[PDB]
Amino acid sequence: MENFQKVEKIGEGTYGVVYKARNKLTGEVVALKKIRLPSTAIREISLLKELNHPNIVKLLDVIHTENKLYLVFEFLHQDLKKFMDASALTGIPLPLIKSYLFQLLQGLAFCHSHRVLHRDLKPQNLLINTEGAIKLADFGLARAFGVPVRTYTHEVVTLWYRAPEILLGCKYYSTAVDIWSLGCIFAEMVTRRALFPGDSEIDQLFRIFRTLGTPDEVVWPGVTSMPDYKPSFPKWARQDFSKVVPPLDEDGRSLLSQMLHYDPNKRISAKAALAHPFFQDVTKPVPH
Numbered sequence: 001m002e003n004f005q006k007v008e009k010i011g012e013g014t015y016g017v018v019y020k021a022r023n024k025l026t027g028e029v030v031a032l033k034k035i036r037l038p039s040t041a042i043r044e045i046s047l048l049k050e051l052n053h054p055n056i057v058k059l060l061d062v063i064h065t066e067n068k069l070y071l072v073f074e075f076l077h078q079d080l081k082k083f084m085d086a087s088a089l090t091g092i093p094l095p096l097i098k099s100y101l102f103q104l105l106q107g108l109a110f111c112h113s114h115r116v117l118h119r120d121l122k123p124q125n126l127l128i129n130t131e132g133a134i135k136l137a138d139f140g141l142a143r144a145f146g147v148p149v150r151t152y153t154h155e156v157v158t159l160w161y162r163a164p165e166i167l168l169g170c171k172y173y174s175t176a177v178d179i180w181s182l183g184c185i186f187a188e189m190v191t192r193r194a195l196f197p198g199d200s201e202i203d204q205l206f207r208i209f210r211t212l213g214t215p216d217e218v219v220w221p222g223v224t225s226m227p228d229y230k231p232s233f234p235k236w237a238r239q240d241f242s243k244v245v246p247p248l249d250e251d252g253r254s255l256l257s258q259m260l261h262y263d264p265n266k267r268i269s270a271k272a273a274l275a276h277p278f279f280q281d282v283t284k285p286v287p288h
């Protein structure tokens with residue numbers, strides 16, 4: 001696009017390269033995603049231009065030209081993954097964790113109210129600024145393109161935040177899949193280690209089962225009829241959350257437990273999570 005001066009490469013996304021760029025006319029600084037490209041995808045993505053919220057990265061423009069799709073986003077200076085890594089020695093202070101979770105739930109509540117799911121939440125698509133805001137990036141792209149096994153650069157797309165219903169082969173995802181992912185990220189902020197760092201679909205599932213118990217018809221009606229469910233799955237006992245996310249307090253453990261319910265019908269909604277007692281003393285700290 002003749003209107004954009006590339007400043008520097010930001011990274012490699014799932015679908016294409018991302019550059020920091022400047023608009024040659026307006027001087028606006030943006031994040032420019034270049035995807036090597038489907039008419040249904042364009043329709044779907046174009047409708048995301050109206051899905052505006054303070055905790056969703058703004059989609060400024062969608063430019064389809066010469067069999068390439070450019071997505072022009074607001075620029076944020078850092079992702080949560082880098083912040084977590086830089087905070088590895090001391091950890092992210094609880095009040096900032098709480099603020100971030102609160103804001104992310106607001107973002108989800110908004111998108112879910114418009115029946116738009118993310119489906120591939122991970123620390124790398126959560127973006128932060130120096131004023132204490134956090135925003136969800138790439139919302140809606142999974143419905144338009146699918147979530148592939150490998151990225152455009154052949155990198156493995158992480159399974160760590162994937163909900164069990166997806167792993168077990170359900171074709172119809174609900175908004176609950178995003179609550180699962182956010183619960184995994186919450187736990188990761190608190191403990192400074194990924195909750196379920198699976199390196200294959202079955203390793204991912206068995207890591208979930210080892211912590212939360214192997215699901216059965218008691219806790220998840222219909223689970224044994226799911227496409228990829230096998231009666232031969234080992235039967236692991238459920239662990240206490242006290243062991244899973246120390247030293248998180250009882251309000252946080254309660255919220256996390258409800259975000260990781262097996263049955264997507266039982267899993268807490270973003271709206272209901274915002275009303276949880278964990279947020280009674282929520283503040284908006286500024287990060288290091």
Ligand SMILES: COC1CCN(c2nccc(Nc3cc4c(ccn4C4CCCC4)cn3)n2)CC1
Pocket residue numbers: 010011012013014018031033057073074075076077078079124125126127137138
């Ligand atoms: C997977 O590669 C990651 C590399 C590190 N990250 C990053 N570091 C600095 C600034 C920034 N700014 C930024 C990134 C943005 C947007 C809108 C979308 N993205 C990325 C997020 C996931 C892939 C597209 C706005 N600012 N992002 C996220 C992308």
